[PDB]
């Protein structure tokens, strides 16, 4: 399991627009097109992102290259991060996965906010991560996909994706 397939599961994948579980407009594989109400303000944002004109409709080559974008976007971003780097860096393969999920999701800046609970995975007290991660609007909103990141990070395996 990676990175790809394991946001692939939680992402899935859609050829048409679509709003996601916050109601924005989304497309591929967990690309956020736009906060805006506008359906056609989201068409412009993706002939753009895709470099032609859609009519709102994607390939799943293209809907793949965007997602291999976001994804390396997402560690970029981990890694320009002064409060993420150090995390990051201080954590083994599988948990790094977690972190670059949530910050796929959430932003950087989202992420970068759990300042109790990222100290804690620094020091490695993985039972008190979890318990802190879990008091969050981000677990009560999408708790499913909340509970396997946050076992994934308690754990350091990928038996919830398994
Ligand atoms: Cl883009
Ligand atoms: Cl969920």
């Given at each position: 399991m990676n990175i790809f397939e394991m946001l692939?599961?939680?992402?899935?994948?859609?050829?048409?627009?679509?709003?996601?579980?916050?109601?924005?407009?989304?497309?591929?594989?967990?690309?956020?097109?736009?906060?805006?109400?506008?359906?056609?303000?989201?068409?412009?944002?993706?002939?753009?992102?895709?470099?032609?004109?859609?009519?709102?409709?994607?390939?799943?080559?293209?809907?793949?290259?965007?997602?291999?974008?976001?994804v390396?976007?997402?560690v970029?971003?981990?890694?320009?991060?002064?409060?993420?780097?150090?995390?990051?860096?201080?954590?083994?393969?599988?948990?790094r996965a977690?972190?670059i999920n949530?910050?796929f999701?959430?932003?950087?800046?989202?992420?970068?906010?759990?300042?109790?609970?990222?100290?804690?995975?620094?020091?490695?007290?993985?039972?008190?991560?979890?318990?802190?991660?879990?008091?969050?609007?981000?677990?009560?909103?999408?708790?499913?996909?909340?509970?396997?990141?946050?076992?994934?990070?308690?754990?350091?395996?990928?038996?919830?994706?398994?």
């Amino acid at each position: 399991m990676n990175i790809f397939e394991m946001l692939r599961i939680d992402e899935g994948l859609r050829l048409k627009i679509y709003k996601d579980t916050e109601g924005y407009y989304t497309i591929g594989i967990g690309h956020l097109l736009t906060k805006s109400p506008s359906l056609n303000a989201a068409k412009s944002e993706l002939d753009k992102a895709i470099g032609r004109n859609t009519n709102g409709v994607m390939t799943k080559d293209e809907a793949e290259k965007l997602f291999n974008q976001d994804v390396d976007a997402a560690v970029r971003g981990i890694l320009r991060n002064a409060k993420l780097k150090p995390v990051y860096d201080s954590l083994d393969a599988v948990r790094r996965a977690a972190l670059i999920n949530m910050v796929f999701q959430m932003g950087e800046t989202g992420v970068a906010g759990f300042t109790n609970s990222l100290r804690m995975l620094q020091q490695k007290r993985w039972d008190e991560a979890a318990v802190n991660l879990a008091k969050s609007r981000w677990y009560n909103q999408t708790p499913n996909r909340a509970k396997r990141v946050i076992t994934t990070f308690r754990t350091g395996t990928w038996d919830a994706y398994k």
